[PDB]
Design a protein around this ligand. Structure first.
Ligand SMILES: O=C(N[C@]12C[C@](c3nnc(-c4ccncn4)n3-c3ccccc3Cl)(C1)C2)c1ccccn1
Ligand SMILES: [Zn+2]
Length: 204
């Protein structure tokens, strides 16, 4: 594999930074929690820095190609990703070949600036069948995983409510409550930097 997981202490400023981004970017969704469950906060159990030399070299290499095509600017963002493939992704990297061509913005790898948006995809599209144990999209017991990834957007194409990025572009920015979604069409345009193990918290 070549992937090493570095457990971050809760008292580490790095852990706290990722923890605060996760908690502070939660929103009330249009679907009343149908997809990702009902909650306004998380129980953050574990934040691990994903360390893989091969995947990092792959990412930096593509980042340079994108910068040269976009006026020496990668347009790099820290974004959340959720999918049933998190354990595969941290070992083999993101893989466009597994992207679903029926998705809202086509066969791409989706990211969000709102943790609660990526939480909607943890158990599949529209939260699929929910948690494997209880078949519950609002399950407060089963532990979920998000990635907080370094994403090269380059020149992003604005699209409203597609196998590759349009000509001259490196990504898609969607806006459908309008929460921004970001789509890349090449797996090496994202590094899965932090693995976050959490639960959605039951409201009082
Ligand atoms: O990158 C991998 N998988 C994916 C990361 C994926 C993804 N990203 N965004 C979405 C995605 C998001 C929203 N709408 C439509 N697609 N998907 C996705 C693709 C197919 C089924 C389910 C998902 Cl979540 C393709 C799930 C992968 C899979 C196996 C080994 C290594 N990497
Ligand atoms: Zn469950």
């Amino acid at each position: 594999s070549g992937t090493i997981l570095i457990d971050l202490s809760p008292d580490d400023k790095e852990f706290q930074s990722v923890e605060e981004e996760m908690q502070s970017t939660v929103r009330e969704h249009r679907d009343g929690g149908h997809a990702g469950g009902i909650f306004n906060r998380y129980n953050i159990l574990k934040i691990q820095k994903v360390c893989n030399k091969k995947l990092w070299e792959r990412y930096t290499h593509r980042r340079k190609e994108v910068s040269e095509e976009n006026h020496n600017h990668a347009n790099e963002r820290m974004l959340f990703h959720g999918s049933p493939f998190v354990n595969a992704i941290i070992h083999k990297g993101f893989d466009e070949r597994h992207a679903y061509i029926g998705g809202m913005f086509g066969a791409g790898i989706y990211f969000a600036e709102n943790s609660s948006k990526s939480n909607q995809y943890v158990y599949g599209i529209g939260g699929g069948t929910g948690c494997p144990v209880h078949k519950d999209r609002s399950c407060y017991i089963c532990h979920r995983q998000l990635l907080f990834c370094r994403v090269t957007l380059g020149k992003s194409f604005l699209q409203f409510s597609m196998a590759h990025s349009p000509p001259g572009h490196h990504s898609v920015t969607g806006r459908p409550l309008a929460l921004a979604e970001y789509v890349i069409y090449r797996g090496e345009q994202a590094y899965p930097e932090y693995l976050i193990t959490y639960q959605i918290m039951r409201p009082e």
